[PDB]
Amino acid sequence: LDPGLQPGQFSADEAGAQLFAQSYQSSAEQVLFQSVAASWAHDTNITAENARRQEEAALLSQEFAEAWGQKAKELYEPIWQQFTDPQLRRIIGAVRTLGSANLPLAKRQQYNALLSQMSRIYSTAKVCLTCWSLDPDLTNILASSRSYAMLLFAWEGWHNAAGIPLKPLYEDFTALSNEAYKQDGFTDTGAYWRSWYNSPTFEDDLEHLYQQLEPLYLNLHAFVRRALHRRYGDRYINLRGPIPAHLLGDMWAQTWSNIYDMVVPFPDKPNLDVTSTMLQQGWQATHMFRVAEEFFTSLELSPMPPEFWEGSMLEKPADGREVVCHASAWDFYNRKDFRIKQCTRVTMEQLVVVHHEMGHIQYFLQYKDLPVSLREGANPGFHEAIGDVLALSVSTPEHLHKIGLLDRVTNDTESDINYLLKMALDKIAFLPFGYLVDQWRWGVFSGRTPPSRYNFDWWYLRTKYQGICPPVTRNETHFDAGAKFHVPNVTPYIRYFVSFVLQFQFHEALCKEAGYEGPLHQCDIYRSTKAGAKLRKVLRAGSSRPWQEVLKDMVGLDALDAQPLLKYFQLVTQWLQEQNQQNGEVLGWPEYQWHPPLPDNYP
Numbered sequence: 001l002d003p004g005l006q007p008g009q010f011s012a013d014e015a016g017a018q019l020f021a022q023s024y025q026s027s028a029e030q031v032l033f034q035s036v037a038a039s040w041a042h043d044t045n046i047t048a049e050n051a052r053r054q055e056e057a058a059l060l061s062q063e064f065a066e067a068w069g070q071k072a073k074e075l076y077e078p079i080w081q082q083f084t085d086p087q088l089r090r091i092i093g094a095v096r097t098l099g100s101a102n103l104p105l106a107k108r109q110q111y112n113a114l115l116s117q118m119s120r121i122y123s124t125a126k127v128c129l130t131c132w133s134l135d136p137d138l139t140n141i142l143a144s145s146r147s148y149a150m151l152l153f154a155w156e157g158w159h160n161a162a163g164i165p166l167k168p169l170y171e172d173f174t175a176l177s178n179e180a181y182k183q184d185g186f187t188d189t190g191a192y193w194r195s196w197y198n199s200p201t202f203e204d205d206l207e208h209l210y211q212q213l214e215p216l217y218l219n220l221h222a223f224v225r226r227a228l229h230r231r232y233g234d235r236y237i238n239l240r241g242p243i244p245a246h247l248l249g250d251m252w253a254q255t256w257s258n259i260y261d262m263v264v265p266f267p268d269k270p271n272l273d274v275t276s277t278m279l280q281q282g283w284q285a286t287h288m289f290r291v292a293e294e295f296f297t298s299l300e301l302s303p304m305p306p307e308f309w310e311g312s313m314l315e316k317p318a319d320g321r322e323v324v325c326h327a328s329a330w331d332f333y334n335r336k337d338f339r340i341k342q343c344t345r346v347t348m349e350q351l352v353v354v355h356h357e358m359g360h361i362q363y364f365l366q367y368k369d370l371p372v373s374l375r376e377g378a379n380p381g382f383h384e385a386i387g388d389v390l391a392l393s394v395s396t397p398e399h400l401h402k403i404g405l406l407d408r409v410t411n412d413t414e415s416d417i418n419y420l421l422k423m424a425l426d427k428i429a430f431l432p433f434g435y436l437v438d439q440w441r442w443g444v445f446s447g448r449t450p451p452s453r454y455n456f457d458w459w460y461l462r463t464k465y466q467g468i469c470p471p472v473t474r475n476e477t478h479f480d481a482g483a484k485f486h487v488p489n490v491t492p493y494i495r496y497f498v499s500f501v502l503q504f505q506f507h508e509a510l511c512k513e514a515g516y517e518g519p520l521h522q523c524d525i526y527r528s529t530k531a532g533a534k535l536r537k538v539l540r541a542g543s544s545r546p547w548q549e550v551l552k553d554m555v556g557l558d559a560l561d562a563q564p565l566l567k568y569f570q571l572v573t574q575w576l577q578e579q580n581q582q583n584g585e586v587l588g589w590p591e592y593q594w595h596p597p598l599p600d601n602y603p
């Protein structure tokens with residue numbers, strides 16, 4: 001560790017810890033910057049040399065974290081929890097958590113190499129017939145093909161190509177991760193991840209939320225299943241069994257927006273799939289990012305800085321480079337460099353992803369002057385919700401008309417049902433998937449799910465919650481959890497379930513602050529500077545205060561609550577129940593063992 005980056009001495013009291021935290025701040029920004037920069041160089045240019053450089057940067061980060069972590073415990077272990085300054089407690093509490101820096105050198109190097117190899121495997125996997133990549137080739141197949149056989153080839157090809165080689169690395173990663181966090185006092189890595197929410201009843205509270213939401217999903221599922229049956233027939237769709245996992249428009253069946261044309265109940269109302277109009281009008285990636293920015297500035301939030309426009313990667317490179325295409329937002333921890341890396345495609349769903357990522361950037365901009373340990377969301381679900389809340393306003397038929405994507409305007413019951421059904425295909429279909437991913441991972445970290453049951457327990461949960469089945473037989477050579485980005489890239493997932501509930505609480509509060517008095521699902525907070533100011537107070541807080549209190553200041557309640565989501569969807573919830581009843585549907589999938597047959601002469 002360079003001399004300028006090492007911790008000195010400080011007195012063993014609160015006045016000293018304050019000076020300790022200020023000296024830490026200075027050197028942490030340098031160490032974090034070099035680590036984020038090396039990660040950027042690799043993720044926009046996957047090469048063996050760039051991976052080597054990223055591993056060396058990660059090792060330096062661990063050396064820094066150990067030195068300052070050990071100094072914090074040396075001086076403050078018996079007194080930090082009684083400090084008067086609540087922000088200083090949170091800073092010291094974070095610095096004394098070493099994570100992977102608890103491992104000995106040889107195991108640190110093994111850990112860093114596993115992260116690098118798992119990332120490379122996921123983002124360079126191909127399906128060959130001449131080879132298709134996930135983004136854009138396989139993505140476009142899953143969204144627009146209606147050939148059962150072509151969808152099956154793409155789904156099976158991707159899951160085999162990405163998942164099978166990841167499994168031995170993921171086993172080794174799990175054991176090293178658990179060994180590291182056991183030294184911080186956690187029973188396993190999952191217990192450390194859940195601790196970020198500072199709620200002793202976290203798992204029960206989530207289960208109670210899902211009980212309120214499940215009927216809405218069961219009814220959307222049965223309605224969509226019926227539509228698929230009319231197109232694919234009784235051989236490939238069982239009206240009392242799970243839906244084949246490759247027929248819902250998306251590689252993970254996690255958002256169903258791309259099958260809207262098969263389910264839309266009132267098709268002579270205005271056409272809400274505005275992707276065609278974006279194409280017809282010549283929208284490109286940079287248009288999409290500028291339109292998102294202007295929503296933020298309409299609220300008197302910050303524009304994107306020059307450093308963002310000069311540094312970001314907003315299209316997939318055409319120069320034969322391998323990149324990580326999965327969209328992401330970047331804080332370089334120097335209060336100046338902020339970027340997005342996205343292989344942007346011209347579609348309405350991608351316009352929503354652009355808003356999602358710009359919400360992350362806006363948080364970074366607003367909390368950049370806090371101490372580095374407090375530059376995070378009040379909890380991770382807050383960070384995930386910011387951009388989605390603004391996109392709820394952008395998606396409204398009224399707002400799409402204002403930006404030239406919907407010429408005709410209607411305000412009637414049929415048009416509302418169309419809109420709420422389209423929104424449900426995104427927000428309601430996702431809920432079981434958002435909930436189940438970390439149930440799977442918590443069981444792997446705790447040891448309830450050993451390697452011998454990775455795929456058995458994954459498909460148990462996929463069927464239990466989403467009501468889908470794999471369209472070809474799977475066994476424990478397959479590792480289908482690994483074919484989802486966040487698993488090999490070690491990103492937690494329960495934050496997205498939390499976000500999809502929270503964003504409707506945020507929306508209701510901002511709409512009220514803006515003075516809006518119509519139906520919640522027709523609110524558009526565009527140009528509301530009062531709503532902007534309420535949101536800004538959240539963003540500028542970072543993690544300096546307990547999330548329960550920040551939430552109470554914003555929405556008037558100190559807990560997650562499903563009521564605003566239920567209020568938003570109420571009209572289509574009622575309508576779908578009526579339709580399924582009149583159609584005589586069975587809600588659920590009691591033929592839980594059913595799988596579809598293979599196509600004749602496949603492949």
Ligand SMILES: *[C@@H]1O[C@H](CO[C@@H]2O[C@@H](C)[C@@H](O)[C@@H](O)[C@@H]2O)[C@@H](O[C@@H]2O[C@H](CO)[C@@H](O[C@@H]3O[C@H](CO)[C@@H](O)[C@H](O)[C@@H]3O)[C@H](O)[C@H]2NC(C)=O)[C@H](O)[C@H]1NC(C)=O
Pocket residue numbers: 398411517518519522
């Ligand atoms: C689409 O249309 C709805 C429904 O409008 C209502 O029903 C129609 C059949 C007509 O009879 C309309 O004249 C009638 O308003 C609109 O929702 C309605 O918005 C108005 C405000 O613009 C609401 O009135 C307010 O209600 C609050 C109390 O909640 C009072 O304090 C206010 O003084 C004011 O009276 C009305 O409650 C609301 N109705 C419903 C069912 O939500 C909606 O605004 C419109 N959408 C667009 C984009 O124009």
Ligand SMILES: C[C@H](N[C@H](C(=O)O)[C@@H]1CCCN1C(=O)[C@@H](N)CC(=O)O)C(=O)N1CCC[C@H]1C(=O)O
Pocket residue numbers: 326327328329330353356357360383384486491496
């Ligand atoms: C498209 C989105 N990409 C993630 C996100 O933006 O959350 C990326 C990859 C993992 C983290 N991440 C970041 O950008 C972080 N750096 C943010 C931060 O540091 O706070 C994604 O995975 N989403 C969108 C909703 C559903 C879910 C999905 O598509 O499965």
Ligand SMILES: *[C@@H]1O[C@H](CO)[C@@H](O[C@@H]2O[C@H](CO)[C@@H](O)[C@H](O)[C@H]2NC(C)=O)[C@H](O)[C@H]1NC(C)=O
Pocket residue numbers: 045047048049050
């Ligand atoms: C992708 O990364 C490679 C390194 O892995 C870069 O290659 C270097 O390019 C510079 C150009 O100024 C040369 O001076 C180095 O000798 C190259 N290194 C190696 C190992 O070949 C490459 O430039 C990067 N590509 C892009 C587009 O950034």
Ligand SMILES: *[C@@H]1O[C@H](CO[C@@H]2O[C@@H](C)[C@@H](O)[C@@H](O)[C@@H]2O)[C@@H](O)[C@H](O)[C@H]1NC(C)=O
Pocket residue numbers: 472473474475476477
């Ligand atoms: C696991 O599955 C592997 C490949 O899938 C199999 O081959 C296709 C063509 C179908 O027969 C499908 O039903 C099978 O699952 C096999 O290579 C492998 O031997 C299977 N078993 C084990 C223990 O790996």
Ligand SMILES: [Ca+2]
Pocket residue numbers: none
């Ligand atoms: Ca981050």
Ligand SMILES: [Cl-]
Pocket residue numbers: 193380381492493494495
């Ligand atoms: Cl999380």
Ligand SMILES: [Zn+2]
Pocket residue numbers: 356360383384
């Ligand atoms: Zn996000």
